[PDB]
Design a protein around this ligand. Structure first.
Ligand SMILES: Nc1ncnc2c1ncn2[C@@H]1O[C@H](COP(=O)(O)OP(=O)(O)O[C@H]2O[C@H](CO)[C@@H](O)[C@H](O)[C@H]2O)[C@@H](O)[C@H]1O
Ligand SMILES: Nc1ncnc2c1ncn2[C@@H]1O[C@H](COP(=O)(O)OP(=O)(O)O[C@H]2O[C@H](CO)[C@@H](O)[C@H](O)[C@H]2O)[C@@H](O)[C@H]1O
Ligand SMILES: [Cl-]
Ligand SMILES: [Cl-]
Ligand SMILES: [Zn+2]
Ligand SMILES: [Zn+2]
Ligand SMILES: [Zn+2]
Ligand SMILES: [Zn+2]
Lengths: 313, 308
């Protein structure tokens, strides 16, 4: 098909769609420290679920090799000290269980644990943005094969958030509308649950990228409630299981995109959180490193069609 | 001990964190001489119209953007030029093995192609880049680089214009004119200086920066082409020795084709070299903020001491 450039407020950048790219030739542990019974081999615990239960289903712990130091906080008040929080979420007691294998309720409990930790961190005025994310598979950057995700509290609003705030503001000012409240008309619907919808994003950065989006206008992920957590957990699991089947269990990353902690009232109407899932299908080269512009070999129209047709029976 | 650093050129914070490097882990061809019929249409060669060619610039067979959608121009048509620069008649030679003169010819080719392209009002920015090695993204094992001409100025060019502008407004200075006092000098030639950038995105990243204030790469002349050739050869060879011949990417950062007069005083082209040492995860995809396990102070001391 013919190449196209697409833009979206959320990314606030163009992406190249070009399927002819896919047609080019080319010349080229049963336990771990995260496993139950081995807690003393981990950096300190923040909490577990159930609370203080020796028979835990998840734990939220400090990252033992953290990118940022929680002990540089008061100094945090072209260079700034490397203060922040880096935590790990152990999603299973069993090494061989993956996130998508967990049932909706349990996935919901992991989501509520994200929520609890965000709320702890947000008591610090030094923190401006909290990034939750998950790596599964070596080529998606994973170093622990055990099923886990991570949280990184930042003293600064990072560039995707600045970009999204600018793009979503411009769209609100031109149309009066939150672009994500209009996800069903602006993007390609795959599946829908009671409170969330998953779409293939119109101006998708990566092939088979998927966004899961609250249908209600909701600025902060941390505003998630128990009922919405189980509903999101089922939709997240479905999207992961449909990805696993259709694309032959590739590695993936997922990333919650949420509100800055100090979001202003005037930002609220066009600030709407979402969950981004990127199956790891290939790397980038010099074009992308040079420009910050990506090349996508699959149109989201085709992703949605295919992903709608996926049968998990 | 971890730290955040910013630079007007990236216009973004990067996180330096050396502890991160301690964590454990559980884990012939169609471009060769005479096979030109197996290639997309030639744009030119060097020497010009010589059957005994040294380099060729040709159309990309599987283009990201179509050179045939020009009149047609949340959506725009996928118009642009996607060109391949074949760097050798021979398959086993890699760019860094070429002599400074021959590397300069490649750099002069880039400039000639740039200037062909700048005759198109439809075009706003041209990205010259190279991939060497499968993990840096290569599909053709033959030595080659690429040119992507875009109808719009892309995110890093916008960030750079913004960040270099703010710095110029704050200081009256062009920040890359201050390279020797802002970054960590590794090597220097008659007209270029190579550095480990202060707020480098990637471990072992190196910039090659004209010492004269020069907004466009394509203003390169024959003398500077050879001078740059040798400094680029030198950095590529130092990387291969120090770092056990890793894959790499390099990227020319240059000015938009329609750069305004008032943007000139703070607009300064440079060549970025990124040895391919690590991948990203969800933090970088989520935020667009990177994590760099090696301070540029440390890269520069190591690279100064490499002997070939
Ligand atoms: N005993 C222990 N107790 C507590 N924590 C322990 C531990 N042993 C190991 N850890 C931590 O566990 C984490 C596991 O994380 P992942 O496997 O998701 O990817 P990682 O963060 O290594 O790297 C990927 O994700 C990061 C974040 O995006 C990228 O920067 C990087 O390039 C990519 O490879 C590591 O951060 C590690 O420090
Ligand atoms: N017979 C022929 N005639 C003309 N051209 C031919 C040809 N046969 C192959 N080609 C082209 O030659 C190029 C070889 O380029 P590279 O090895 O630098 O990486 P490639 O562009 O494949 O992908 C890497 O670079 C891009 C851009 O940075 C990333 O998007 C991508 O993920 C990464 O793998 C390809 O672009 C291909 O289209
Ligand atoms: Cl939140
Ligand atoms: Cl140029
Ligand atoms: Zn384990
Ligand atoms: Zn909304
Ligand atoms: Zn060859
Ligand atoms: Zn300058």
């Amino acid at each position: 098909q013919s190449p196209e450039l697409r833009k979206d407020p959320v990314t606030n950048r163009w992406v190249i769609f070009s399927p002819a790219r896919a047609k080019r030739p080319t010349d080229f542990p049963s336990s771990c420290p995260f496993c139950i019974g081995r807690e003393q081999e981990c950096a300190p615990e923040l909490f577990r679920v159930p609370d203080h239960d020796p028979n835990w289903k998840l734990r939220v712990i400090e990252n033992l090799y953290p990118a940022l130091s929680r002990n540089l906080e008061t100094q945090s008040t072209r260079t700034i000290v490397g203060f922040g929080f880096h935590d790990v979420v152990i999603e299973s007691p069993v090494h061989s269980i993956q996130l998508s294998d967990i049932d909706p309720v349990g996935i919901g409990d992991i989501l509520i644990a994200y929520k609890k930790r965000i709320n702890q961190i947000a008591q610090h005025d030094s923190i401006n943005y909290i990034q939750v994310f998950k790596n599964q598979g070596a080529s998606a950057g994973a170093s622990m094969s055990h099923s886990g995700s991570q949280m990184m509290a930042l003293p600064v609003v990072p560039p995707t958030v600045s970009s999204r705030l600018d793009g979503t503001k411009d769209y609100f000012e031109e149309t009066g509308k939150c672009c994500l409240c209009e996800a069903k008309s602006k993007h390609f619907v795959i599946d829908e649950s009671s409170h969330f919808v998953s779409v293939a994003p119109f101006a998708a950065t990566y092939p088979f990228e998927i966004w899961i989006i609250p249908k209600d206008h909701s600025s902060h992920f941390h505003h998630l409630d128990d009922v919405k957590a189980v509903d999101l957990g089922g939709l997240l699991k479905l999207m992961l299981q449909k990805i696993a089947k259709q694309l032959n269990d590739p590695p993936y990353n997922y990333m919650i995109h949420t509100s800055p902690l100090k979001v202003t009232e005037s930002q609220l109407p066009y600030t709407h959180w979402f969950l981004q899932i990127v199956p790891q299908l290939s790397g980038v080269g010099g074009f992308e490193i040079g420009t910050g512009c990506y090349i996508n070999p699959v149109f989201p129209e085709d992703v949605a069609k295919v992903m709608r047709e996926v049968s998990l029976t």
